Write a protein that holds these residues in place. Sequence first.
Motif, PDB file in Angstrom:
ATOM      1  N   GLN A   1      -3.367  -5.043  25.269  1.00 32.75           N
ATOM      2  CA  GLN A   1      -3.783  -5.169  23.880  1.00 32.75           C
ATOM      3  C   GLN A   1      -3.342  -3.923  23.116  1.00 32.75           C
ATOM      4  O   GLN A   1      -3.695  -2.801  23.492  1.00 32.75           O
ATOM      5  CB  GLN A   1      -5.300  -5.399  23.818  1.00 32.75           C
ATOM      6  CG  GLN A   1      -6.111  -4.482  22.926  1.00 32.75           C
ATOM      7  CD  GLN A   1      -7.591  -4.848  22.933  1.00 32.75           C
ATOM      8  OE1 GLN A   1      -8.197  -5.023  21.884  1.00 32.75           O
ATOM      9  NE2 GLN A   1      -8.172  -4.974  24.122  1.00 32.75           N
TER      10      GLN A   1
ATOM     11  N   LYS B   1      -2.863  -1.993  19.275  1.00 30.22           N
ATOM     12  CA  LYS B   1      -3.269  -1.885  17.877  1.00 30.22           C
ATOM     13  C   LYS B   1      -2.386  -0.855  17.197  1.00 30.22           C
ATOM     14  O   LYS B   1      -2.383   0.320  17.582  1.00 30.22           O
ATOM     15  CB  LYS B   1      -4.738  -1.472  17.746  1.00 30.22           C
ATOM     16  CG  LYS B   1      -5.739  -2.433  18.370  1.00 30.22           C
ATOM     17  CD  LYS B   1      -5.820  -3.751  17.621  1.00 30.22           C
ATOM     18  CE  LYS B   1      -6.978  -4.592  18.134  1.00 30.22           C
ATOM     19  NZ  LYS B   1      -6.953  -5.971  17.571  1.00 30.22           N
ATOM     20  N   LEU B   2      -1.654  -1.288  16.177  1.00 33.17           N
ATOM     21  CA  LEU B   2      -0.707  -0.453  15.464  1.00 33.17           C
ATOM     22  C   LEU B   2      -1.297  -0.066  14.120  1.00 33.17           C
ATOM     23  O   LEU B   2      -1.878  -0.897  13.430  1.00 33.17           O
ATOM     24  CB  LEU B   2       0.588  -1.219  15.222  1.00 33.17           C
ATOM     25  CG  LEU B   2       1.537  -1.351  16.412  1.00 33.17           C
ATOM     26  CD1 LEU B   2       0.955  -2.037  17.620  1.00 33.17           C
ATOM     27  CD2 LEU B   2       2.794  -2.065  15.949  1.00 33.17           C
ATOM     28  N   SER B   3      -1.121   1.195  13.734  1.00 35.20           N
ATOM     29  CA  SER B   3      -1.676   1.665  12.473  1.00 35.20           C
ATOM     30  C   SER B   3      -0.759   2.743  11.902  1.00 35.20           C
ATOM     31  O   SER B   3       0.250   3.125  12.505  1.00 35.20           O
ATOM     32  CB  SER B   3      -3.121   2.137  12.657  1.00 35.20           C
ATOM     33  OG  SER B   3      -3.179   3.231  13.552  1.00 35.20           O
TER      34      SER B   3
ATOM     35  N   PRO C   1       7.284  -2.419  16.153  1.00 40.67           N
ATOM     36  CA  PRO C   1       6.730  -3.208  17.258  1.00 40.67           C
ATOM     37  C   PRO C   1       7.725  -3.510  18.356  1.00 40.67           C
ATOM     38  O   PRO C   1       7.324  -3.655  19.518  1.00 40.67           O
ATOM     39  CB  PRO C   1       6.237  -4.479  16.564  1.00 40.67           C
ATOM     40  CG  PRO C   1       5.934  -4.035  15.151  1.00 40.67           C
ATOM     41  CD  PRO C   1       7.025  -3.040  14.846  1.00 40.67           C
TER      42      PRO C   1
ATOM     43  N   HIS D   1       6.834 -11.409  18.804  1.00 39.64           N
ATOM     44  CA  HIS D   1       6.617 -10.629  17.593  1.00 39.64           C
ATOM     45  C   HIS D   1       6.478 -11.568  16.396  1.00 39.64           C
ATOM     46  O   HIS D   1       7.329 -12.429  16.186  1.00 39.64           O
ATOM     47  CB  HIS D   1       7.811  -9.717  17.344  1.00 39.64           C
ATOM     48  CG  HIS D   1       8.064  -8.714  18.424  1.00 39.64           C
ATOM     49  ND1 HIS D   1       7.198  -7.683  18.706  1.00 39.64           N
ATOM     50  CD2 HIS D   1       9.128  -8.541  19.245  1.00 39.64           C
ATOM     51  CE1 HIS D   1       7.701  -6.939  19.675  1.00 39.64           C
ATOM     52  NE2 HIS D   1       8.874  -7.437  20.019  1.00 39.64           N
ATOM     53  N   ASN D   2       5.474 -11.347  15.565  1.00 38.21           N
ATOM     54  CA  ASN D   2       5.280 -12.162  14.369  1.00 38.21           C
ATOM     55  C   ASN D   2       6.354 -11.844  13.331  1.00 38.21           C
ATOM     56  O   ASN D   2       6.610 -10.676  13.015  1.00 38.21           O
ATOM     57  CB  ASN D   2       3.901 -11.872  13.776  1.00 38.21           C
ATOM     58  CG  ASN D   2       2.762 -12.557  14.524  1.00 38.21           C
ATOM     59  OD1 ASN D   2       2.940 -13.178  15.565  1.00 38.21           O
ATOM     60  ND2 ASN D   2       1.562 -12.445  13.957  1.00 38.21           N
TER      61      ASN D   2
ATOM     62  N   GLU E   1       6.383  -8.425  11.297  1.00 35.38           N
ATOM     63  CA  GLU E   1       5.126  -7.834  10.868  1.00 35.38           C
ATOM     64  C   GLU E   1       4.754  -6.622  11.713  1.00 35.38           C
ATOM     65  O   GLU E   1       5.110  -6.511  12.887  1.00 35.38           O
ATOM     66  CB  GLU E   1       4.023  -8.870  10.968  1.00 35.38           C
ATOM     67  CG  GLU E   1       4.346 -10.082  10.119  1.00 35.38           C
ATOM     68  CD  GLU E   1       3.208 -11.006   9.957  1.00 35.38           C
ATOM     69  OE1 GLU E   1       2.354 -11.062  10.866  1.00 35.38           O
ATOM     70  OE2 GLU E   1       3.185 -11.690   8.911  1.00 35.38           O
ATOM     71  N   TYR E   2       3.991  -5.717  11.099  1.00 41.56           N
ATOM     72  CA  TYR E   2       3.552  -4.491  11.754  1.00 41.56           C
ATOM     73  C   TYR E   2       2.231  -4.777  12.458  1.00 41.56           C
ATOM     74  O   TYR E   2       1.145  -4.417  11.995  1.00 41.56           O
ATOM     75  CB  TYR E   2       3.417  -3.379  10.732  1.00 41.56           C
ATOM     76  CG  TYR E   2       3.145  -2.018  11.361  1.00 41.56           C
ATOM     77  CD1 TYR E   2       4.153  -1.342  12.053  1.00 41.56           C
ATOM     78  CD2 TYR E   2       1.905  -1.387  11.244  1.00 41.56           C
ATOM     79  CE1 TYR E   2       3.932  -0.107  12.621  1.00 41.56           C
ATOM     80  CE2 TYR E   2       1.687  -0.152  11.819  1.00 41.56           C
ATOM     81  CZ  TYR E   2       2.712   0.487  12.484  1.00 41.56           C
ATOM     82  OH  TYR E   2       2.472   1.714  13.035  1.00 41.56           O
ATOM     83  N   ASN E   3       2.336  -5.468  13.586  1.00 37.01           N
ATOM     84  CA  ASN E   3       1.163  -5.855  14.372  1.00 37.01           C
ATOM     85  C   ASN E   3       1.645  -6.237  15.767  1.00 37.01           C
ATOM     86  O   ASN E   3       2.812  -6.045  16.106  1.00 37.01           O
ATOM     87  CB  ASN E   3       0.367  -6.973  13.684  1.00 37.01           C
ATOM     88  CG  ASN E   3       1.209  -8.198  13.385  1.00 37.01           C
ATOM     89  OD1 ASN E   3       2.181  -8.484  14.074  1.00 37.01           O
ATOM     90  ND2 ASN E   3       0.833  -8.927  12.346  1.00 37.01           N
ATOM     91  N   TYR E   4       0.754  -6.778  16.587  1.00 35.05           N
ATOM     92  CA  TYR E   4       1.117  -7.051  17.969  1.00 35.05           C
ATOM     93  C   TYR E   4       0.153  -8.064  18.570  1.00 35.05           C
ATOM     94  O   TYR E   4      -1.066  -7.903  18.446  1.00 35.05           O
ATOM     95  CB  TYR E   4       1.054  -5.756  18.773  1.00 35.05           C
ATOM     96  CG  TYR E   4       2.105  -5.663  19.832  1.00 35.05           C
ATOM     97  CD1 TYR E   4       1.947  -6.286  21.054  1.00 35.05           C
ATOM     98  CD2 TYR E   4       3.277  -4.991  19.590  1.00 35.05           C
ATOM     99  CE1 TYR E   4       2.923  -6.219  22.010  1.00 35.05           C
ATOM    100  CE2 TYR E   4       4.252  -4.909  20.545  1.00 35.05           C
ATOM    101  CZ  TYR E   4       4.064  -5.509  21.753  1.00 35.05           C
ATOM    102  OH  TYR E   4       5.044  -5.419  22.705  1.00 35.05           O
ATOM    103  N   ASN E   5       0.698  -9.042  19.278  1.00 33.83           N
ATOM    104  CA  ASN E   5      -0.086 -10.046  19.980  1.00 33.83           C
ATOM    105  C   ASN E   5      -0.329  -9.620  21.421  1.00 33.83           C
ATOM    106  O   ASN E   5       0.587  -9.169  22.116  1.00 33.83           O
ATOM    107  CB  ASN E   5       0.672 -11.375  19.982  1.00 33.83           C
ATOM    108  CG  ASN E   5       0.946 -11.886  18.589  1.00 33.83           C
ATOM    109  OD1 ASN E   5       0.069 -11.875  17.742  1.00 33.83           O
ATOM    110  ND2 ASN E   5       2.178 -12.310  18.337  1.00 33.83           N
TER     111      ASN E   5
END
Length: 230
Positions: free
Chosen positions: A204, A206-208, A61, A169-170, A142-146
């Motif tokens: 926005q 989205k990570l996958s 991220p 970043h979380n 974390e493997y995500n994104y705000n």
Amino acid sequence: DPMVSKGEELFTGVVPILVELDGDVNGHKFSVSGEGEGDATYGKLTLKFICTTGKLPVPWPTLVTTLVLCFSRYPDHMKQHDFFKSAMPEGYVQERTIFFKDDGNYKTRAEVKFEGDTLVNRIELKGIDFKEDGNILGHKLEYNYNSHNAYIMADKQKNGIKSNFKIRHNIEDGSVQLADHYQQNTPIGDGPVLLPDNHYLSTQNKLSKDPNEKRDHMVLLEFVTAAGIT
């Protein structure tokens, strides 16, 4: 408007994208290759990035903003303010310093331009002063994104744009690692560009993961839309 038409012409359908980054963070050297496509009509990007040197030494991220704002959706009523497309096909330089709060910083220099029909982002990234078991080098994000909004201003001294904005970043403990971004973009060619009124970009991500991929990698779906100021 013939200048708007020029950018339209280049971005009105699906455009292939290549991304190549060479990085060094606290002496941990790495490379990332990305491939995918963008559809600026919808502000939409879809890429897969692979660390070609093995394990990525920072969290994926933290590289998203570094790894093509010409694919942002500028509403019709704002098309006079789309610097990023106006610089094409010759392209622009995108430079940042990213300050991770209570940790190190990335400095990035990238050139974004067309190579034939393909939009290419070539990046050099240098990271220093990181804590070797902090949130970045210790892989605690974390493997995500705000989702986030970033103000864009004209940078008249550089015939381009500037922007400072915050990414949060979380952290895996529920907290947040701030990444304060300072950005400048300047055109590569000598042609005229569109210098914008103040506005913002809304993003926005989205990570996958690719379930069949054993290399260290990131699949990204991103939407960026221009808005404001009202």
